[PDB]
Amino acid sequence: SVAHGLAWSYYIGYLRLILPELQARIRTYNQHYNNLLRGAVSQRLYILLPLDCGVPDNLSMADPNIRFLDKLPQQTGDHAGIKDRVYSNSIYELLENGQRAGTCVLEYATPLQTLFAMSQYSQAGFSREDRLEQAKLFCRTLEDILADAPESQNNCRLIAYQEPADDSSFSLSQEVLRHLRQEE
Amino acid sequence: SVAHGLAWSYYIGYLRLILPELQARIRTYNQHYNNLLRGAVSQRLYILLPLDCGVPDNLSMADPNIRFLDKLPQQTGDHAGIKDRVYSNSIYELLENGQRAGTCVLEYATPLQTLFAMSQYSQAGFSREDRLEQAKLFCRTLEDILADAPESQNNCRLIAYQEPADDSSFSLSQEVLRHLRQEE
Numbered sequence: 159s160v161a162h163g164l165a166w167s168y169y170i171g172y173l174r175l176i177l178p179e180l181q182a183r184i185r186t187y188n189q190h191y192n193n194l195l196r197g198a199v200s201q202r203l204y205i206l207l208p209l210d211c212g213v214p215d216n217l218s219m220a221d222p223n224i225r226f227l228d229k230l231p232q233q234t235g236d237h238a239g240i241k242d243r244v245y246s247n248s249i250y251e252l253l254e255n256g257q258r259a260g261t262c263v264l265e266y267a268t269p270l271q272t273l274f275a276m277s278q279y280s281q282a283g284f285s286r287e288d289r290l291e292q293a294k295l296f297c298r299t300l301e302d303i304l305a306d307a308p309e310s311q312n313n314c315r316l317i318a319y320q321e322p323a324d325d326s327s328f329s330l331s332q333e334v335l336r337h338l339r340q341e342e
Numbered sequence: 343s344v345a346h347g348l349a350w351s352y353y354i355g356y357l358r359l360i361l362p363e364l365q366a367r368i369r370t371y372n373q374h375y376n377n378l379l380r381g382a383v384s385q386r387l388y389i390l391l392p393l394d395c396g397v398p399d400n401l402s403m404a405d406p407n408i409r410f411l412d413k414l415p416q417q418t419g420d421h422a423g424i425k426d427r428v429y430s431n432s433i434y435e436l437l438e439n440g441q442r443a444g445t446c447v448l449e450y451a452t453p454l455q456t457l458f459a460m461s462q463y464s465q466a467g468f469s470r471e472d473r474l475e476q477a478k479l480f481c482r483t484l485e486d487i488l489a490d491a492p493e494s495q496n497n498c499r500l501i502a503y504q505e506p507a508d509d510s511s512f513s514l515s516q517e518v519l520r521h522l523r524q525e526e
Protein backbone atom coordinates (compact mmCIF):
# COMPACT_ATOMS: atom_id res chain seq x y z
CA SER A 159 0.00 0.00 0.00
CA VAL A 160 0.99 3.67 -0.20
CA ALA A 161 1.07 4.10 3.63
CA HIS A 162 3.27 0.95 4.07
CA GLY A 163 5.81 2.40 1.75
CA LEU A 164 5.80 5.89 3.26
CA ALA A 165 6.13 4.52 6.81
CA TRP A 166 9.25 2.45 5.94
CA SER A 167 10.65 5.38 4.02
CA TYR A 168 10.12 7.62 7.03
CA TYR A 169 11.97 5.06 9.24
CA ILE A 170 14.74 4.02 6.87
CA GLY A 171 15.56 7.46 5.52
CA TYR A 172 15.03 9.52 8.60
CA LEU A 173 14.07 8.18 11.99
CA ARG A 174 16.72 5.41 12.11
CA LEU A 175 19.26 8.05 11.03
CA ILE A 176 18.48 10.80 13.46
CA LEU A 177 16.92 9.24 16.54
CA PRO A 178 20.14 7.40 17.70
CA GLU A 179 22.01 10.73 17.56
CA LEU A 180 19.20 12.94 18.92
CA GLN A 181 20.05 12.57 22.68
CA ALA A 182 23.54 13.83 22.19
CA ARG A 183 22.41 16.75 20.06
CA ILE A 184 19.89 17.81 22.67
CA ARG A 185 22.47 17.51 25.58
CA THR A 186 24.91 19.48 23.44
CA TYR A 187 22.29 22.12 22.93
CA ASN A 188 21.23 22.35 26.54
CA GLN A 189 24.88 22.78 27.63
CA HIS A 190 26.22 25.17 25.01
CA TYR A 191 23.52 26.99 23.15
CA ASN A 192 20.50 26.96 25.44
CA ASN A 193 19.72 30.24 27.15
CA LEU A 194 21.58 30.16 30.50
CA LEU A 195 18.49 31.10 32.41
CA ARG A 196 15.95 28.74 30.92
CA GLY A 197 14.72 25.21 31.34
CA ALA A 198 16.51 22.43 29.48
CA VAL A 199 15.07 21.15 26.21
CA SER A 200 13.27 17.91 26.88
CA GLN A 201 14.57 14.69 25.38
CA ARG A 202 12.85 12.90 22.51
CA LEU A 203 11.47 13.92 19.14
CA TYR A 204 7.81 14.83 19.22
CA ILE A 205 6.10 13.94 15.98
CA LEU A 206 2.73 15.39 15.02
CA LEU A 207 0.38 13.05 13.16
CA PRO A 208 -2.74 14.96 12.09
CA LEU A 209 -4.99 12.33 10.54
CA ASP A 210 -6.51 14.91 8.18
CA CYS A 211 -2.95 15.42 6.87
CA GLY A 212 -3.24 19.19 7.29
CA VAL A 213 0.38 20.09 7.73
CA PRO A 214 1.30 23.78 7.74
CA ASP A 215 4.90 24.66 7.02
CA ASN A 216 4.82 27.27 9.83
CA LEU A 217 3.96 25.54 13.06
CA SER A 218 5.10 28.64 15.08
CA MET A 219 2.32 30.65 13.44
CA ALA A 220 -0.90 28.75 13.03
CA ASP A 221 -0.79 28.19 16.84
CA PRO A 222 -0.40 31.07 19.43
CA ASN A 223 0.73 28.79 22.21
CA ILE A 224 3.48 27.04 20.17
CA ARG A 225 6.48 29.20 19.32
CA PHE A 226 9.83 28.55 17.69
CA LEU A 227 12.83 29.04 20.00
CA ASP A 228 15.85 27.78 18.09
CA LYS A 229 17.42 25.00 16.01
CA LEU A 230 19.30 22.07 17.33
CA PRO A 231 22.85 21.82 15.93
CA GLN A 232 22.67 20.27 12.46
CA GLN A 233 23.40 16.68 11.74
CA THR A 234 25.22 15.97 8.48
CA GLY A 235 25.93 12.79 6.56
CA ASP A 236 26.49 11.51 3.05
CA HIS A 237 23.47 9.77 1.55
CA ALA A 238 22.86 8.60 -2.00
CA GLY A 239 25.78 10.51 -3.56
CA ILE A 240 24.94 13.76 -1.79
CA LYS A 241 27.86 14.96 0.26
CA ASP A 242 26.90 16.40 3.66
CA ARG A 243 23.17 16.03 3.47
CA VAL A 244 21.81 18.09 6.33
CA TYR A 245 19.12 16.98 8.85
CA SER A 246 17.92 19.80 11.04
CA ASN A 247 15.31 19.94 13.86
CA SER A 248 13.58 22.82 15.55
CA ILE A 249 12.96 23.62 19.23
CA TYR A 250 9.58 24.97 20.29
CA GLU A 251 8.14 26.48 23.49
CA LEU A 252 4.73 25.38 24.61
CA LEU A 253 2.49 28.02 26.38
CA GLU A 254 -0.10 27.44 29.13
CA ASN A 255 -1.84 30.52 30.62
CA GLY A 256 0.46 32.99 28.84
CA GLN A 257 3.70 31.34 30.05
CA ARG A 258 6.17 28.58 29.13
CA ALA A 259 5.06 25.18 30.35
CA GLY A 260 7.41 23.13 28.25
CA THR A 261 10.15 23.11 25.67
CA CYS A 262 10.63 20.38 23.08
CA VAL A 263 11.88 19.17 19.68
CA LEU A 264 8.77 19.16 17.60
CA GLU A 265 7.70 18.60 14.00
CA TYR A 266 4.99 17.21 11.76
CA ALA A 267 5.60 13.88 9.97
CA THR A 268 6.43 14.98 6.51
CA PRO A 269 4.96 12.04 4.65
CA LEU A 270 1.48 13.20 5.65
CA GLN A 271 1.98 16.12 3.30
CA THR A 272 2.55 13.61 0.55
CA LEU A 273 -0.79 11.94 1.27
CA PHE A 274 -2.37 15.41 1.22
CA ALA A 275 -0.90 16.35 -2.10
CA MET A 276 -1.75 13.10 -3.62
CA SER A 277 -5.42 13.69 -2.72
CA GLN A 278 -5.12 17.00 -4.58
CA TYR A 279 -3.58 15.90 -7.86
CA SER A 280 -5.77 14.11 -10.26
CA GLN A 281 -2.94 12.13 -11.82
CA ALA A 282 -2.32 10.43 -8.43
CA GLY A 283 -5.73 8.74 -8.51
CA PHE A 284 -6.07 9.08 -4.78
CA SER A 285 -9.28 10.17 -3.12
CA ARG A 286 -9.89 12.02 0.06
CA GLU A 287 -11.33 8.74 1.53
CA ASP A 288 -8.19 6.93 0.60
CA ARG A 289 -6.19 9.65 2.36
CA LEU A 290 -7.79 9.17 5.75
CA GLU A 291 -7.49 5.41 5.52
CA GLN A 292 -3.81 5.69 4.42
CA ALA A 293 -3.14 8.17 7.19
CA LYS A 294 -4.24 5.85 9.91
CA LEU A 295 -2.37 2.98 8.22
CA PHE A 296 0.78 5.11 8.06
CA CYS A 297 0.59 5.79 11.80
CA ARG A 298 -0.12 2.16 12.68
CA THR A 299 2.68 0.90 10.46
CA LEU A 300 5.00 3.38 11.97
CA GLU A 301 4.08 2.35 15.53
CA ASP A 302 4.70 -1.30 14.65
CA ILE A 303 8.12 -0.58 13.27
CA LEU A 304 9.16 1.52 16.23
CA ALA A 305 8.03 -1.15 18.61
CA ASP A 306 10.92 -3.48 17.71
CA ALA A 307 13.34 -0.83 16.67
CA PRO A 308 16.69 -0.38 18.32
CA GLU A 309 16.73 3.12 16.80
CA SER A 310 14.37 3.66 19.46
CA GLN A 311 10.81 4.06 20.20
CA ASN A 312 12.22 5.80 23.23
CA ASN A 313 13.68 8.72 21.49
CA CYS A 314 10.29 9.80 20.04
CA ARG A 315 6.70 10.18 20.80
CA LEU A 316 4.05 9.90 18.15
CA ILE A 317 1.14 12.27 18.63
CA ALA A 318 -1.76 11.19 16.45
CA TYR A 319 -4.89 13.39 16.57
CA GLN A 320 -8.15 14.30 14.82
CA GLU A 321 -9.65 17.79 14.77
CA PRO A 322 -13.44 17.83 14.83
CA ALA A 323 -15.26 18.85 11.58
CA ASP A 324 -18.18 19.30 14.08
CA ASP A 325 -15.90 22.09 15.54
CA SER A 326 -15.13 21.72 19.31
CA SER A 327 -12.04 23.99 19.19
CA PHE A 328 -9.02 21.67 19.38
CA SER A 329 -5.89 22.55 21.41
CA LEU A 330 -2.54 21.43 19.84
CA SER A 331 -0.28 22.79 22.58
CA GLN A 332 -2.32 20.94 25.17
CA GLU A 333 -1.99 17.72 23.15
CA VAL A 334 1.81 18.06 23.12
CA LEU A 335 1.87 19.04 26.76
CA ARG A 336 -0.25 16.07 27.59
CA HIS A 337 2.44 13.87 25.97
CA LEU A 338 5.28 15.92 27.29
CA ARG A 339 3.97 15.59 30.91
CA GLN A 340 3.50 11.84 30.60
CA GLU A 341 7.34 11.99 30.37
CA GLU A 342 7.71 13.87 33.77
CA SER B 343 1.36 0.25 -4.41
CA VAL B 344 4.58 1.01 -2.55
CA ALA B 345 6.27 2.47 -5.66
CA HIS B 346 3.28 4.80 -6.37
CA GLY B 347 3.58 6.33 -2.97
CA LEU B 348 7.36 6.70 -3.14
CA ALA B 349 7.27 8.27 -6.60
CA TRP B 350 4.74 10.92 -5.49
CA SER B 351 6.64 11.61 -2.39
CA TYR B 352 9.88 12.06 -4.37
CA TYR B 353 8.03 14.59 -6.52
CA ILE B 354 6.00 16.38 -3.88
CA GLY B 355 8.69 16.57 -1.21
CA TYR B 356 11.74 17.08 -3.37
CA LEU B 357 11.72 17.42 -7.11
CA ARG B 358 8.86 19.98 -7.32
CA LEU B 359 10.71 22.03 -4.66
CA ILE B 360 14.22 22.00 -6.03
CA LEU B 361 13.96 21.69 -9.77
CA PRO B 362 12.32 25.10 -10.28
CA GLU B 363 15.27 26.71 -8.42
CA LEU B 364 18.02 24.54 -9.79
CA GLN B 365 18.83 26.63 -12.95
CA ALA B 366 19.49 29.66 -10.83
CA ARG B 367 21.70 27.78 -8.31
CA ILE B 368 23.81 26.37 -11.15
CA ARG B 369 24.29 29.93 -12.68
CA THR B 370 25.21 31.23 -9.26
CA TYR B 371 27.70 28.42 -9.00
CA ASN B 372 29.14 28.79 -12.49
CA GLN B 373 29.61 32.57 -12.10
CA HIS B 374 30.77 32.96 -8.49
CA TYR B 375 32.09 29.70 -7.15
CA ASN B 376 33.17 27.55 -10.06
CA ASN B 377 36.96 27.36 -10.61
CA LEU B 378 37.92 30.21 -13.03
CA LEU B 379 39.65 27.98 -15.46
CA ARG B 380 37.05 25.24 -15.68
CA GLY B 381 34.10 24.37 -17.86
CA ALA B 382 30.66 25.41 -16.62
CA VAL B 383 28.53 22.92 -14.70
CA SER B 384 25.93 21.58 -17.05
CA GLN B 385 22.34 22.35 -16.36
CA ARG B 386 19.83 19.80 -15.09
CA LEU B 387 19.70 17.31 -12.29
CA TYR B 388 20.97 13.91 -13.23
CA ILE B 389 19.23 11.20 -11.25
CA LEU B 390 20.55 7.66 -11.09
CA LEU B 391 17.95 4.90 -11.04
CA PRO B 392 19.63 1.51 -10.56
CA LEU B 393 16.81 -1.02 -10.85
CA ASP B 394 18.63 -3.37 -8.49
CA CYS B 395 18.35 -0.59 -5.91
CA GLY B 396 22.06 -0.70 -5.00
CA VAL B 397 22.64 2.80 -3.79
CA PRO B 398 26.04 3.51 -2.29
CA ASP B 399 26.29 6.57 -0.08
CA ASN B 400 29.61 7.39 -1.75
CA LEU B 401 29.24 7.67 -5.50
CA SER B 402 32.70 9.31 -5.78
CA MET B 403 34.62 6.56 -3.95
CA ALA B 404 32.58 3.85 -5.70
CA ASP B 405 33.41 4.66 -9.33
CA PRO B 406 36.90 5.48 -10.52
CA ASN B 407 35.71 7.81 -13.34
CA ILE B 408 33.09 9.71 -11.29
CA ARG B 409 34.49 12.09 -8.76
CA PHE B 410 33.11 14.74 -6.41
CA LEU B 411 34.07 18.37 -7.22
CA ASP B 412 31.92 20.56 -4.99
CA LYS B 413 28.53 21.43 -3.59
CA LEU B 414 26.03 23.74 -5.09
CA PRO B 415 24.95 26.57 -2.79
CA GLN B 416 22.33 25.27 -0.33
CA GLN B 417 18.66 25.76 -0.78
CA THR B 418 16.71 26.42 2.44
CA GLY B 419 13.03 26.49 3.31
CA ASP B 420 10.50 25.96 6.10
CA HIS B 421 8.86 22.52 5.88
CA ALA B 422 6.50 20.67 8.19
CA GLY B 423 7.47 22.80 11.14
CA ILE B 424 11.22 22.55 10.52
CA LYS B 425 12.79 25.92 10.18
CA ASP B 426 15.38 26.31 7.38
CA ARG B 427 15.28 22.75 6.11
CA VAL B 428 18.33 22.29 3.93
CA TYR B 429 18.35 20.76 0.39
CA SER B 430 21.89 20.30 -0.88
CA ASN B 431 23.24 18.88 -4.20
CA SER B 432 26.67 17.77 -5.27
CA ILE B 433 28.73 18.37 -8.41
CA TYR B 434 30.70 15.52 -9.93
CA GLU B 435 33.31 15.26 -12.74
CA LEU B 436 32.85 12.58 -15.33
CA LEU B 437 36.14 11.06 -16.66
CA GLU B 438 36.74 9.55 -20.13
CA ASN B 439 40.33 8.28 -20.64
CA GLY B 440 41.71 10.18 -17.57
CA GLN B 441 40.14 13.30 -19.20
CA ARG B 442 37.34 15.38 -17.68
CA ALA B 443 34.59 14.88 -20.29
CA GLY B 444 31.75 16.32 -18.24
CA THR B 445 30.64 18.12 -15.14
CA CYS B 446 27.11 17.66 -13.78
CA VAL B 447 24.91 17.71 -10.71
CA LEU B 448 24.42 14.04 -9.95
CA GLU B 449 22.81 11.80 -7.37
CA TYR B 450 20.90 8.58 -6.80
CA ALA B 451 17.12 8.65 -6.28
CA THR B 452 16.91 8.16 -2.58
CA PRO B 453 13.71 6.15 -2.50
CA LEU B 454 15.41 3.20 -4.20
CA GLN B 455 17.31 2.81 -0.96
CA THR B 456 13.98 2.45 0.80
CA LEU B 457 12.95 -0.34 -1.51
CA PHE B 458 16.35 -2.02 -0.82
CA ALA B 459 16.00 -1.78 2.91
CA MET B 460 12.51 -3.02 2.83
CA SER B 461 13.64 -6.16 1.02
CA GLN B 462 16.12 -6.66 3.90
CA TYR B 463 13.79 -6.35 6.85
CA SER B 464 11.53 -9.14 7.82
CA GLN B 465 8.82 -6.98 9.21
CA ALA B 466 8.38 -5.13 5.83
CA GLY B 467 7.06 -8.33 4.22
CA PHE B 468 8.67 -7.32 0.99
CA SER B 469 10.59 -9.76 -1.14
CA ARG B 470 13.47 -9.28 -3.45
CA GLU B 471 11.12 -10.05 -6.41
CA ASP B 472 8.77 -7.39 -5.17
CA ARG B 473 11.71 -4.99 -5.07
CA LEU B 474 12.55 -5.29 -8.72
CA GLU B 475 8.92 -4.95 -9.70
CA GLN B 476 8.45 -1.86 -7.45
CA ALA B 477 11.64 -0.37 -8.76
CA LYS B 478 10.50 -0.37 -12.29
CA LEU B 479 7.05 0.87 -11.28
CA PHE B 480 8.75 3.70 -9.33
CA CYS B 481 10.68 4.79 -12.42
CA ARG B 482 7.67 4.63 -14.73
CA THR B 483 5.48 6.48 -12.24
CA LEU B 484 8.09 9.12 -11.90
CA GLU B 485 8.40 9.48 -15.72
CA ASP B 486 4.59 9.86 -15.93
CA ILE B 487 4.52 12.56 -13.29
CA LEU B 488 7.39 14.50 -14.84
CA ALA B 489 5.71 14.39 -18.22
CA ASP B 490 2.91 16.76 -17.19
CA ALA B 491 5.01 18.56 -14.65
CA PRO B 492 4.91 22.38 -14.98
CA GLU B 493 7.86 21.98 -12.54
CA SER B 494 10.59 20.38 -14.52
CA GLN B 495 10.77 17.50 -16.83
CA ASN B 496 13.10 20.08 -18.40
CA ASN B 497 15.51 20.38 -15.42
CA CYS B 498 16.24 16.70 -14.81
CA ARG B 499 17.26 13.60 -16.59
CA LEU B 500 16.30 10.15 -15.35
CA ILE B 501 18.96 7.51 -15.87
CA ALA B 502 17.52 4.03 -15.32
CA TYR B 503 19.93 1.13 -15.76
CA GLN B 504 20.51 -2.52 -15.02
CA GLU B 505 23.92 -4.10 -14.26
CA PRO B 506 24.27 -7.49 -15.93
CA ALA B 507 24.53 -10.14 -13.08
CA ASP B 508 26.27 -12.39 -15.73
CA ASP B 509 29.14 -9.88 -15.19
CA SER B 510 29.65 -8.05 -18.49
CA SER B 511 31.23 -4.65 -17.80
CA PHE B 512 28.91 -1.76 -17.07
CA SER B 513 30.25 1.79 -17.14
CA LEU B 514 28.29 4.29 -14.98
CA SER B 515 30.32 7.30 -16.16
CA GLN B 516 29.69 6.33 -19.78
CA GLU B 517 26.02 5.89 -19.08
CA VAL B 518 25.87 9.38 -17.57
CA LEU B 519 27.98 10.79 -20.36
CA ARG B 520 25.70 9.29 -22.97
CA HIS B 521 22.89 11.23 -21.27
CA LEU B 522 24.85 14.37 -20.84
CA ARG B 523 26.04 14.43 -24.48
CA GLN B 524 22.59 13.66 -25.90
CA GLU B 525 21.83 17.38 -25.78
CA GLU B 526 23.78 20.00 -27.82
Ligand SMILES: Nc1nc(=O)c2ncn([C@@H]3O[C@@H]4COP(=O)(O)O[C@H]5[C@@H](O)[C@H](n6cnc7c(N)ncnc76)O[C@@H]5COP(=O)(O)O[C@@H]3[C@@H]4O)c2[nH]1
Pocket residue numbers: 164167168169170171172173240243244245246265266267268269272351352354355356357422424428429430451452453456
Ligand atom coordinates in the same frame (compact mmCIF):
# COMPACT_ATOMS: atom_id res chain seq x y z
N1 LIG C 1 10.91 15.86 8.38
C1 LIG C 1 11.96 15.46 7.69
N2 LIG C 1 13.23 16.07 7.66
C2 LIG C 1 14.26 15.58 6.92
O1 LIG C 1 15.37 16.15 6.96
C3 LIG C 1 13.99 14.52 6.18
N3 LIG C 1 14.74 13.79 5.38
C4 LIG C 1 13.99 12.80 4.91
N4 LIG C 1 12.75 12.93 5.44
C5 LIG C 1 11.55 12.17 5.28
O2 LIG C 1 12.07 10.88 5.50
C6 LIG C 1 11.53 9.91 4.52
C7 LIG C 1 12.65 9.32 3.68
O3 LIG C 1 13.50 10.38 3.15
P1 LIG C 1 14.18 10.09 1.78
O4 LIG C 1 15.42 10.92 1.78
O5 LIG C 1 14.30 8.57 1.67
O6 LIG C 1 13.04 10.47 0.63
C8 LIG C 1 13.02 11.83 0.29
C9 LIG C 1 14.20 11.99 -0.70
O7 LIG C 1 14.26 10.90 -1.81
C10 LIG C 1 13.81 13.18 -1.25
N5 LIG C 1 14.25 14.21 -0.43
C11 LIG C 1 13.77 15.02 0.50
N6 LIG C 1 14.80 15.77 0.89
C12 LIG C 1 15.88 15.41 0.22
C13 LIG C 1 17.11 15.87 0.22
N7 LIG C 1 17.43 16.87 1.06
N8 LIG C 1 17.99 15.32 -0.57
C14 LIG C 1 17.65 14.28 -1.42
N9 LIG C 1 16.38 13.82 -1.45
C15 LIG C 1 15.52 14.44 -0.61
O8 LIG C 1 12.33 13.24 -1.22
C16 LIG C 1 11.81 12.17 -0.54
C17 LIG C 1 10.52 12.53 0.25
O9 LIG C 1 10.84 13.64 1.05
P2 LIG C 1 10.00 13.91 2.36
O10 LIG C 1 8.49 14.10 2.09
O11 LIG C 1 10.60 15.06 3.05
O12 LIG C 1 9.96 12.78 3.47
C18 LIG C 1 11.10 12.05 3.79
C19 LIG C 1 10.63 10.63 3.58
O13 LIG C 1 9.13 10.31 3.83
C20 LIG C 1 12.77 13.95 6.23
N10 LIG C 1 11.74 14.39 6.96
